Design a protein around this ligand. Structure first.
Ligand code: FE
Ligand code: FE
Lengths: 210, 213
């Protein structure tokens, strides 16, 4: 049984992007609800004492939906920062190699998050076999982790993530999101994806959050 | 070449269920956008001069997403009424038969609409082979029509359909929706589903909603 993580920044620290109320609802209610739903669903089952990483990579159905949503949001929050941070030279190099330039990566990342139809998530994930960074869009609760890929960056595109401050204007929301990307954290994720592979995710969930 | 349908009621007629602003965005922007997207996507293609029913039942990809979303919303708007209207004796009989009672149908319909995960629609559709009314949930833009079934009632559960007035409280939104069901329209759909089958859908789209001028 898990507990909702603390937001890694103050609710009023990103006024050009999300408002305190947006956070109250997204984190305080939606995220909270996924935590409570998982706890209630695993009670008396094979996962009642399993780690989130365990449940995430092994479960399915509702248990998965909730487990994954808890992970996706936790990851999403860490991808955000009040103030801009710099990219590690390795991440920068990797992005320019796999995308041509940082500007092209942005363009590709945003366009992909713009066209994702219905509820979902838009990721930048490290492929272990290809050793390349891919821009992947997943629907509803899915996450690249179940495809053996390591999340480096993600933006929530479920409408509840931006309707309060932006209504239907997802593009504006995306542009504001990009400006607040916690490159420092994206850099960490990359470095460890290369060193521990999918194991870095395990560590993240268990040693960095839950 | 399509144009956004007129809302079948006043934007301020839906009490605490849907507010005028909610309508400005849902109909005025989301629905409007699917119309504009489809028009732009078919320009210069095989579907350029096709009817919505045609495109809806034959296309796929983005063309389908937009085509279906146009239909789904059109249908959704007609399922709403400033005040709940009456059920035809046939529809009532049919619902009691396939669900036990109206109250049980409500219970089942609402529960199915409540658990549908992610974006989607919650329908009550007539099965032509079984001649039974089924409660079906579809994801994103899908609609029973592609499974040869006739929509009788639907509720939009994409979050944009209720976030403005209800935020995350889909259940409250669903309970309010139910109180505004245009049974008169649901009855029409049923009668014609039995008489013209999937053809009633064709007529609905081409003849009474998107009649070119
Ligand atoms: Fe979310
Ligand atoms: Fe809608």
């Amino acid at each position: 049984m898990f507990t909702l993580r603390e937001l890694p920044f103050a609710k009023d620290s990103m006024g050009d992007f999300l408002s305190p109320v947006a956070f109250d609802f997204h984190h305080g209610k939606h995220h909270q609800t996924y935590v409570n739903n998982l706890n209630n669903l695993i009670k008396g089952t094979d996962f009642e004492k399993s780690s989130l990483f365990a449940i995430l990579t092994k479960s399915s159905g509702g248990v998965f939906n909730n487990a994954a949503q808890i992970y996706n949001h936790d990851f999403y929050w860490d991808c955000l920062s009040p103030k801009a941070t710099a990219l590690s030279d390795e991440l920068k190099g990797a992005l320019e190699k796999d995308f041509g330039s940082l500007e092209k990566f942005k363009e590709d990342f945003i366009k992909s998050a713009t066209t994702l139809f219905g509820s979902g998530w838009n990721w930048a994930a490290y492929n272990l076999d290809t050793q390349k960074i891919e821009i992947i869009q997943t629907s509803n609760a899915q996450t690249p982790v179940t495809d053996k890929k390591v999340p480096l960056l993600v933006v929530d595109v479920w409408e509840h993530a931006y309707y309060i401050d932006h209504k239907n204007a997802r593009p504006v929301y995306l542009e504001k999101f990009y400006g607040h990307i916690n490159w420092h954290f994206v850099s960490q994720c990359y470095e460890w994806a290369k060193k521990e592979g999918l194991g870095s995710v395990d560590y993240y969930i268990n040693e960095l959050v839950h």
